[PDB]
Amino acid sequence: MRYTIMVSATASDAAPLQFLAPYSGCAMAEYFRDTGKHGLIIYDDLSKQSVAYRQMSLLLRRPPGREAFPGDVFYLHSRLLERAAKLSKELGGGSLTAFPVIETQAGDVSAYIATNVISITDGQIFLETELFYKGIRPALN
């Protein structure tokens, strides 16, 4: 905790706060990116920020798309994760490494938010239930 910021919009909190908390944490870690240092940011359950944004959009009566999601739920995560960059030497040379976390239902990688964030991020770490139940931990596919 000497080096960590801990931003939390928990399950009891309002869906605007859960929608906004990865942007708040990204603005806090972009301080270290912009002044030449290096940041690590973990968005734990970006699949819950997408659900909070879907709540906000259907309560704003915006037209639901695939699964019910507003249609700019790709833009929600793309404009989030694009700030995880490695800057050039003229901008200080700072970096920001992102670890988005997406919970998957029964291993369905072909879900909407899952295939959204897969086509944003530079790689994946797949963790399987069949390797995790056998005790192979971390259950890295």
């Binding site: 037209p63 798309g65 695939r66 249609g71 833009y75």
Partner: protein, 53 residues
Amino acid sequence: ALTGLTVAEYFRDIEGQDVLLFVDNIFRFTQANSEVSALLGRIPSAVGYQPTL
């Protein structure tokens, strides 16, 4: 995508020569107009898209 098309269409129509146009994810054009079309007051078409897809 229309900007990249305009740059390609100058070389096709005015310079009069062969162009290679590579467009990474022309789907994002449709997805962007689908983000926009919700706020333009349009009744949505199938799955969630604009009526003018």
